[PDB]
Amino acid sequence: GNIRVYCRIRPALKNLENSDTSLINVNEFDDNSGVQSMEVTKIQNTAQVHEFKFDKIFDQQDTNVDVFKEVGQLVQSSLDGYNVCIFAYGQTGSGKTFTMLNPGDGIIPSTISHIFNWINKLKTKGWDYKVNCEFIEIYNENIVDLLKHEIRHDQETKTTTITNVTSCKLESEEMVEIILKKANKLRSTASTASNEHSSRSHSIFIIHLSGSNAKTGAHSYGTLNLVDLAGSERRLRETQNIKKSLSCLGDVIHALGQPHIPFRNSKLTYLLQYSLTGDSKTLMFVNISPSSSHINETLNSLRFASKVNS
Ligand SMILES: Nc1ncnc2c1ncn2[C@@H]1O[C@H](COP(=O)(O)OP(=O)(O)O)[C@@H](O)[C@H]1O
Ligand SMILES: [Mg+2]
């Protein structure tokens, strides 16, 4: 289905960074165009302006709440039976985990709440929805249950399962609480947190929405995959792993946007293939720092993003 790309510039961590030797200029959304443009320039050559176009660009002023205002309609399509993928891409420090897991705010916590509200609002229509989830990480192309792991693709239902991975029902906000509180401490920057490892691995929060209509007899199944990718910044075979996995993902998303998708070329794209094909909806989130000390990695992330939307 639809493939969208959003860029997100996080607030500068003052006293640590500044924009003294670079310039990132974001233009307002243009309806004439349908996209939003931004310009990046390095002080050592202000004549060379790198322009980038996206479906939407969030700046230092956009909060997580602001970000979700553009994500809500996407994730609610899962109640219609659509699969959805939301990827957070960017260098370590750009704000991927904050965007996806910030307590109560992140795309994941917000998505769960939004779905819950929709479930109840749909209850008055004969719909009974059930929600279950899994939280895993892909490190060095191996799957680890964060809550033997083999990927089982069901050509019949066009759904995917992973053997021996914990799955939890989400029928209470209390449950969502323990899980999310757990996910955050695992991936968020905390002194006693393995962010070193988290920066070198992909983390995927999978949510399955199964709805049945007692009277209408209709049924519905949609899966949401919320990915917090490994840092894209420029253990050699391991770095090559991260590098090739991220490059593979780009090839696939790009290919998918085209009018032989290399799904099997990486553990992540192979796992998510059913949620990436068909009328599935994909949202690529490119996180970048506004600071001059990261301008080069920033241009790399923005280049990856431009490819993925061609
Ligand atoms: N949108 C944001 N608003 C406020 N702080 C942010 C935002 N994004 C990131 N940060 C902060 O920036 C630092 C980088 O965070 P993080 O999301 O963990 O980066 P990454 O996951 O890309 O390595 C953290 O201290 C985080 O709290
Ligand atoms: Mg992180």
From Swiss-Prot:
Residues 2-310 form the Kinesin motor domain. It is found in: Cytoplasm, Cytoskeleton, Microtubule organizing center, Spindle pole body; Nucleus; Cytoplasm, Cytoskeleton; Chromosome. Induction: By alpha factor. Disulfide bonds: none annotated. Disruption phenotype: Short mitotic metaphase spindles with splayed microtubules (MTs) increasing spindle width. Disrupts the poleward movement of kinetochores on MTs; abolishes poleward sliding along the lateral side of MTs and increases end-on pulling. During karyogamy, (the mating step where nuclei fuse), abolishes the formation of a MT bridge between the two nuclei thereby leading to a failure in nuclear fusion. Abnormal meiosis I; cells do not progress past prophase I, interhomolog recombination is abnormal and the organization of MTs is abnormal. Belongs to the TRAFAC class myosin-kinesin ATPase superfamily. Kinesin family. NCD subfamily. Interacts with CIK1; the interaction is direct. Interacts with VIK1; the interaction is direct. Minus end-directed microtubule (MT) motor involved in spindle midzone assembly, poleward transport of newly captured kinetochores along the lateral side of MTs, karyogamy (nuclear fusion) during mating, and with an essential function in meiosis I. Functions together with the accessory proteins CIK1 or VIK1. Drives the poleward transport of newly captured kinetochores along the lateral side of MTs, both during S-phase and during M-phase. KAR3 contains two globular domains separated by an alpha-helical coiled coil. The N-terminal portion of KAR3 contains a microtubule association domain distinct from the kinesin-like C-terminal domain. Present with 3250 molecules/cell in log phase SD medium. This is Kinesin-like protein KAR3. It comes from Saccharomyces cerevisiae (strain ATCC 204508 / S288c). The gene is KAR3.
